[PDB]
From a paper:
The shuttling of insoluble retinoids across the IPM involves the retinol-binding protein 3 (RBP3), which is a large approximately 140 kDa glycoprotein, present in almost all vertebrates. RBP3 resides mainly in the IPM, and it transports retinoids, fatty acids such as docosahexaenoic acid (DHA), and other hydrophobic molecules like retinoic acid, cholesterol and alpha-tocopherol, between the RPE and the photoreceptors, playing an important role in the visual cycle. Based on molecular characteristics, RBP3 consists of four tandem homologous modules of approximately 300 amino acids each, but elucidation of the three-dimensional structure of the intact multi-modular RBP3 has been largely evasive. The binding of retinoids to RBP3 protects the photoreceptors by preventing photodegradation of the retinoids, and it regulates their transport across the IPM.
Author numbering: 32 to 91, 110 to 284, 309 to 393, 417 to 702, 721 to 1001, 1031 to 1124, 1135 to 1233
The structure:
C-alpha cells in the first residue's frame, strides 16, 4: 500500500489518516492480519468503509477509425429517431485525428432525426479532455458557461466544464429533445456526462440510477502479477425501448391538447368560464410530463384549477291481462303503518312510457289506499332507479302549497343546446296528494341516479325532507369521450353534459345531496318515526313563541310584523327542515334577529373582609397631571351600594374628590344591572335642580317612566364644571352602556374607546308552554331625554375610536391638549395682532379672540382644533386667506401682432442669471411687432420682487414713473416701488394666482393698458407661514396690503374685474379681435 500514500491526499476524507496506514509502508508479510486473497476484501469492508469514498478496489489514420467504428452504430429508427452508442470516451488528441470523421459522416445523419438517444451503459473508462466537446456538440448555444465541481490532484487545478466553440457545423437544435441511457457498467467518465445534463435540464435520465462515483480511477501495475491498482485519484435492460415509448408519447404531447381544446368548448355546459379555460389550456408544459401516469396527474390538477369546479367530472386515468297488473302490484308495495302513515317503497323507475301506458293499474293499486294517510313516508333506499324520464311525472302528484302551475327545474343539454322548462303536469289522473302533513324520503348510499334526482328535487322545492345517509352521488348524465388511444395507452376523458339549473338559478354540479338527518341506513326508519312524532307539534312551539313575544317585548311596532311573519312561515311550512329542537331554536333565533333588526333577542334549548373585598374590586390612583383613574371592575348592585355608604365613600370617593379631572375605567365591567345607575349619575350634576336623565319605557307597566337625579345623597359632589372621561371597550357590560348613553346625551363626558355591541338594559328569560324551549327577550327600553327616540340598540359610538389598550394614553393626550388650549389661543391672538395686513383689524381680532375660551374648552381631539380655529379666524376676518394646518412662450399673431404667455414666477436673483437669455428669446420676436398680447390666466404664483423687472422691461428708459406704497408689517414701515433704470391688453381669468393680478392692477392705474377677461380670484400677497408653540398649528398670515392707491379701496378679497366679461377659452380668441380693428 505504498502507492496509496502519495496519489490520494484529499483532506475531505483523509486529513492525513492514511499516514498511519502509510506507516505500514512495505508490509510484505502481514498475512497474519488476513490471508492473501482477502485483506483487500477486508479492506473493502475496512478502510473503504471508513473512507466513505465512491468505491475502492484492491485485488490480490484508418486504424483509429476501425477501433472507434465498432464502438458506435447510428441509424434512423422509426418515429425519425437516432441512436448513438460509445464504448471509448474520446480525447483532445483523438479529435485531432478523428474529429473530422465524426462530424462529416456520423454527425450528419444525427441532425436528420427528430429525437436523439445516447447510450452510456457500456462506457468503462476514458480521458477527461473529451467531456467539454460532447456537451458543446449537444449545447445549442455559443456562450461559454462553466458549472462543475471536479478537481484533479496531479493537475492541482479545479476543473469546470467549458462549452468550447471548437465544434464544426451546426449545433444541436434546442427544440428537439434527448435522453441519456445508463446501467451498472457505466464508467465514471460517462457518469458526469449525464450529471451535467441533468443539472442543465436539457436532457432527461432513464433507467437505473448510475453509480455516480469518481470520473476516473488511477491505474498502477507493480509486483509479479495478480493485481493492478484502480485508486480514484480524480475527484434496467428494457430501458432501451422505454425511452422510445416516452418519445412516442412526447411526440404526441404537442397534440395532446388540440383535441382537449376541441371537446371542452363543444357547447355551453362546461365552458361557462371559457375565457379562463382556453387561456390555461395552452399553459401546460410538455417538458414537465415524463410519463403516461404523470401526464394523468398533471392534466387532472390543471383542469380542475382553471374551471374552479373540482367536484365536476374531470379527466380519468387511462384504460388498459293478469301478469301485467300482477307485476304492477309486485313492483310497488304500500302498507298502512300504524298511526295513519302511508309507507311506500320503490325498486326501479322503469320508463316514462311504461308508467304512462300502465297508469290506471298503478294508481288504482297505490293511491287508493294512500289517499287517507295523514303523513306519507317513501323508502327508496333499495332503488338504483336508472332513467330519469319519469321524474317530472311523479313530482306532479305533490301539488305543493300553490295549486297553480309552477316550474320545477330547468334542464339544458349540451348535445341539443336546448333549455327546457319542466312545468308541473296538471292533467294527471290522480287525487293530487297534498304536501301538507309532510312527506319523508328514506335515502341510503345506493340511490344511484333517478332516485337521487327525485330526492334532490324534493329537497330543493322544500316539499320534503330527507332522512338517512348521504347519497352515492353517481349520475348518468355524463358521456365519456375517446381521447388519444394508441397501442397500450388508451387514455379516456369524461365530460358532463347536463347543467340542471334549479329553481333558485344556481347550477347543481352534483356529486351527492346532504340530507337533513345524517343517520345510519338501518336506523333510518326509527329516526323517521321520531321525526314524525316531533313534527306533529311544530305549530304549537311557533304559536307559543309568537304569543310570548307579543306579551313581553319592549317594542310593539316590531311585534306587529313579527307575529304575521312567523304565522305566515308556519302556514307555508318552512320549518319542516328542522329535525330536532336545537335546530328549530337556531332557526327561530336566525329569523327573529334577521327580520326584527335586534340581535339581543335569543332562544335557547334548556369590616376587614369588606375592606379587602372593596380594595380588590377597585383600582384607585391619581395619575400625574391631576387626573383620577377610578376603575369599576364590577359594580351591579341595587341597594347595597347605598347601604355601604361612608365605609366606601371615605375610602375611595373622598380620595379623588379634588382631582380636578376624573376618568372612569369602564373597559372591564361585565356588570349588567341597570338598577341603581341614576344614583351614581346624580353626583356629577348640580344638586339643586331636578335634571331629567332619561326615560324608561316598560312593556309590563305599558307606560313611559321618568328617571330623575337624587336631590341629595352625600355631601361630596364632584362638580359641574370639572371635566370627565369614560372608557368603553367591546367587553363592556350593560350598566356601562347606560352610563355612557346618559353622559353622552346630556353632553357631560367624552367617550373614548371602541364601539360596544349589545344594550340589553333588562332581560328576562321566559318559558314557552313546552318545557325544552326558553326565550330570552329584552323586557325593557330607554328613551333619551332630548328626544323620544329609543337608544341606538347597538351600543355607544365613541367620539374617539381607538383600541382599548391605547385608550388611556389617548385620554392623557386629550387632557393635555385641553390644558394647552388657552395658551395656544393667547399666542395665536398675539401673533395675529403683531402681523397682519391691517394693524387695527389684527388688534380687533386679538381682542375678540380672547372671548372664545368657553367654546374651545370642549375640543374633541387634535386636528379639529386647527379646522375650528381656521373657521373662527375666517369669520372674524373677511379675508379667506387665513388657513391653519396640521402635520416662457413667444409667438406672433396674424396682422403683425405679437403674443406673450407665461405662468411661473422666479426670484429676481434666479431671473438675473437667465436675464441675458430672455433678451434674445422673448424680445427678439416682439421687437418689431405692432401690438402685443399677454396671457397669465394660468398663473401659479411667486414672490412680488419680480414685479419691478416686468415693469422695467416693458417700460422704455426714462425717469421713474411707477408709484406703489405698501405697508410691510414685518418691516414695520412702508416701501415705494421704483422701476429699474404701441398697445397691450391683459388676458386674465379666475385661475390667476394672488401673485398675478398686481401686475394687472398697476397696468390699469397708469392707463397704458386695458384689461380683458373676467373676475380674478381675489388673492393676496404670498403668505408667510408661522409656527405656534404647539407642533400641530401652522398659521398663515397675509400681509403687505397694497395701500398706496389714492382711493384706499384695495383689490384684496374682492379681486379685479375687467371692463368686458368673456370666457377664458374665448378670451384668447377675443384678445386679437379688437387689436386688428384698432389697427384696421
Amino acid at each position: 500500500a505504498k502507492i496509496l500514500l502519495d496519489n490520494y491526499c484529499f483532506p475531505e476524507n483523509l486529513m492525513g489518516m492514511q499516514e498511519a496506514i502509510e506507516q505500514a509502508t512495505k508490509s510484505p508479510e502481514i498475512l497474519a492480519i488476513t490471508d492473501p486473497q482477502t485483506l483487500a476484501h477486508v479492506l473493502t469492508a475496512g478502510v473503504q468503509n471508513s473512507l466513505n469514498d465512491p468505491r475502492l478496489i484492491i485485488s490480490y489514420l484508418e486504424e483509429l477509425i476501425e477501433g472507434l467504428h465498432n464502438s458506435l452504430r447510428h441509424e434512423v429508427l422509426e418515429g425519425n429517431v437516432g441512436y448513438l452508442r460509445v464504448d471509448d470516451i474520446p480525447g483532445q488528441e483523438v479529435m485531432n485525428k478523428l474529429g473530422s470523421f465524426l462530424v462529416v459522416n456520423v454527425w450528419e445523419k444525427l441532425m436528420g432525426t427528430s429525437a436523439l438517444v445516447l447510450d452510456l451503459r457500456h462506457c468503462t473508462r476514458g480521458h477527461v479532455s473529451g467531456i467539454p466537446y460532447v456537451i458543446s456538440y449537444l449545447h445549442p448555444g455559443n456562450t461559454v458557461l462553466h458549472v462543475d465541481t471536479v478537481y484533479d490532484r496531479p493537475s492541482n487545478t479545479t476543473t469546470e466544464i467549458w462549452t468550447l466553440p471548437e465544434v464544426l457545423g451546426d449545433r444541436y437544435s434546442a427544440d428537439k429533445d434527448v435522453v441519456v441511457l445508463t446501467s451498472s457498467h457505466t464508467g465514471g467518465v460517462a457518469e458526469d456526462i449525464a450529471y451535467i445534463l441533468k443539472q442543465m435540464r436539457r436532457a432527461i435520465v432513464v433507467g437505473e440510477r448510475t453509480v455516480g462515483g469518481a470520473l476516473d480511477l488511477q491505474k498502477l501495475r507493480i509486483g509479479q502479477s495478480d493485481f493492478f491498482l484502480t485508486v480514484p485519484v480524480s475527484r434496467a435492460e428494457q430501458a432501451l425501448e422505454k425511452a422510445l415509448a416516452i418519445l412516442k408519447l412526447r411526440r404526441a404531447l404537442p397534440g395532446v391538447i388540440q383535441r382537449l381544446q376541441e371537446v371542452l368548448q363543444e357547447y355551453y355546459t362546461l365552458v361557462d368560464r371559457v375565457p379562463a379555460l382556453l387561456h390555461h389550456l395552452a399553459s401546460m408544459d410538455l417538458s414537465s410530463v415524463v410519463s403516461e401516469e404523470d401526464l394523468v396527474t398533471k392534466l387532472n390538477a390543471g383542469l380542475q384549477a382553471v374551471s374552479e369546479d373540482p367536484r365536476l367530472l374531470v379527466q380519468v386515468v387511462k384504460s388498459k291481462e293478469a301478469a301485467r297488473r300482477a307485476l304492477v302490484d309486485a313492483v310497488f308495495q304500500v302498507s298502512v303503518l300504524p298511526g295513519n302513515v302511508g309507507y311506500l317503497r320503490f325498486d326501479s323507475f322503469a320508463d316514462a312510457s311504461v308508467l304512462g301506458v300502465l297508469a290506471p293499474y298503478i294508481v288504482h293499486q297505490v293511491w287508493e289506499p294512500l289517499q287517507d294517510t295523514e303523513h306519507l313516508i317513501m323508502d327508496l333506499r333499495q332503488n338504483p332507479g336508472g332513467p330519469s324520464t319519469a321524474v317530472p311525472l311523479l313530482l306532479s302528484y305533490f301539488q305543493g302549497p300553490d295549486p297553480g302551475p309552477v316550474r320545477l327545474f330547468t334542464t339544458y343539454d349540451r348535445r341539443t343546446n336546448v333549455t327546457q322548462e319542466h312545468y308541473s303536469h296538471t292533467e294527471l289522473l290522480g287525487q293530487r296528494y297534498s304536501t301538507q302533513g309532510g312527506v319523508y324520503l328514506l335515502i341510503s348510499h345506493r340511490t344511484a341516479t333517478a332516485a337521487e334526482e327525485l330526492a334532490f328535487l324534493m329537497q330543493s322545492l322544500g316539499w320534503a325532507t330527507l332522512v338517512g345517509e348521504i347519497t352515492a352521488g353517481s349520475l348518468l348524465h355524463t358521456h365519456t369521450v375517446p381521447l388519444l388511444e394508441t397501442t397500450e395507452g388508451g387514455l379516456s376523458l369524461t365530460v358532463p353534459v347536463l347543467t340542471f339549473i334549479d329553481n333558485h338559478g344556481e347550477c347543481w354540479l352534483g356529486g351527492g345531496v346532504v340530507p337533513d338527518a345524517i343517520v345510519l341506513a338501518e336506523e333510518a326508519l326509527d329516526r323517521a318515526q321520531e321525526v314524525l312524532e316531533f313534527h306533529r307539534s311544530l305549530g304549537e312551539l311557533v304559536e307559543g313563541t309568537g304569543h310570548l313575544l307579543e306579551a313581553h317585548y319592549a317594542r310593539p311596532e316590531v311585534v306587529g310584523q313579527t307575529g304575521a311573519l312567523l304565522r305566515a312561515k308556519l302556514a307555508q311550512g318552512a320549518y319542516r327542515t328542522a329535525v330536532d329542537l336545537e335546530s328549530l331554536a337556531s332557526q327561530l333565533t336566525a329569523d327573529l334577529q334577521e327580520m326584527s333588526g335586534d340581535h339581543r333577542l335569543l332562544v335557547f334549548h334548556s369590616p376587614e373582609e369588606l375592606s379587602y373585598l372593596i380594595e380588590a374590586l377597585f383600582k384607585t390612583e391619581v395619575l400625574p397631571g391631576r387626573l383620577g383613574y377610578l376603575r369599576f371592575d364590577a359594580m351591579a348592585e341595587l341597594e347595597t351600594v347605598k347601604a355601604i355608604g361612608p365605609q366606601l365613600v371615605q375610602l375611595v370617593w373622598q380620595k379623588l374628590i379634588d382631582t380636578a379631572a376624573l376618568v372612569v375605567d369602564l373597559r372591564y365591567n361585565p356588570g349588567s344591572y341597570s338598577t341603581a345607575v341614576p344614583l351614581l349619575c346624580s353626583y356629577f350634576f348640580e344638586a339643586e335642580p331636578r335634571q331629567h336623565l332619561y326615560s324608561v319605557f316598560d312593556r309590563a307597566t305599558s307606560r313611559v317612566m321618568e328617571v330623575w337625579t337624587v336631590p341629595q345623597v352625600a355631601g361630596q359632589r364632584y362638580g359641574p364644571q370639572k371635566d370627565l372621561y369614560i372608557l368603553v371597550s367591546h367587553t363592556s357590560g350593560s350598566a356601562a352602556e347606560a352610563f355612557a348613553h346618559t353622559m353622552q346625551d346630556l353632553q357631560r363626558a367624552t367617550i373614548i374607546g371602541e364601539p360596544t355591541a349589545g344594550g340589553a338594559l333588562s332581560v328576562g328569560i321566559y318559558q314557552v308552554g313546552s318545557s325544552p324551549l326558553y326565550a330570552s327577550m329584552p323586557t325593557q327600553m330607554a328613551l333619551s331625554a332630548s328626544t323620544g327616540e329609543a337608544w341606538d340598540l347597538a351600543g355607544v359610538e365613541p367620539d374617539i375610536t381607538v383600541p382599548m389598550s391605547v385608550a388611556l394614553s389617548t385620554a392623557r393626550d386629550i387632557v393635555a391638549l385641553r390644558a394647552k388650549v388657552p395658551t395656544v389661543l393667547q399666542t395665536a391672538g398675539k401673533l395675529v395682532a403683531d402681523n397682519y395686513a391691517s394693524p387695527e383689524m389684527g388688534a380687533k381680532i386679538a381682542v375678540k379672540l380672547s372671548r372664545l375660551q368657553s367654546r374651545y374648552a370642549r375640543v374633541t381631539s387634535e386636528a379639529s382644533l386647527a379646522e375650528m380655529l381656521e373657521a373662527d379666524l375666517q369669520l372674524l376676518s373677511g379675508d379667506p386667506h387665513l388657513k391653519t394646518a396640521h402635520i416662457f412662450h413667444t409667438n406672433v399673431l396674424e396682422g403683425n401682432i405679437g403674443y406673450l404667455r407665461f405662468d411661473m414666477f422666479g426670484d429676481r436673483e434666479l431671473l438675473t442669471q437667465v436675464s441675458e437669455l430672455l433678451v434674445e428669446h422673448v424680445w427678439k420676436k416682439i421687437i418689431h411687432t405692432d401690438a402685443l398680447i399677454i396671457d397669465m390666466r394660468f398663473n401659479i404664483g411667486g414672490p412680488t420682487s419680480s414685479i419691478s423687472a416686468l415693469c422695467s422691461y416693458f417700460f422704455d428708459e426714462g425717469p421713474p414713473i411707477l408709484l406703489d406704497k405698501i405697508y410691510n408689517r414685518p418691516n414695520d414701515s412702508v416701501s415705494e416701488l421704483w422701476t429699474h433704470t404701441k398697445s397691450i391688453i391683459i388676458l386674465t381669468s379666475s385661475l390667476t394666482a394672488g401673485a398675478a393680478e398686481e401686475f394687472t392692477y398697476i397696468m390699469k392705474r397708469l392707463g397704458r393698458a386695458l384689461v380683458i377677461g373676467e373676475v380674478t380670484s381675489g388673492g393676496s400677497q404670498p403668505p408667510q407661514t408661522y409656527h405656534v408653540d404647539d407642533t400641530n398649528l401652522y398659521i398663515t398670515i397675509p400681509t403687505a396690503r397694497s395701500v398706496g392707491a389714492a382711493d384706499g379701496s384695495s383689490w384684496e378679497g374682492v379681486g379685479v374685474v375687467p371692463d368686458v366679461a368673456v370666457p377664458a377659452e374665448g378670451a384668447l380668441a377675443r384678445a386679437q379681435e379688437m387689436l386688428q380693428h384698432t389697427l384696421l
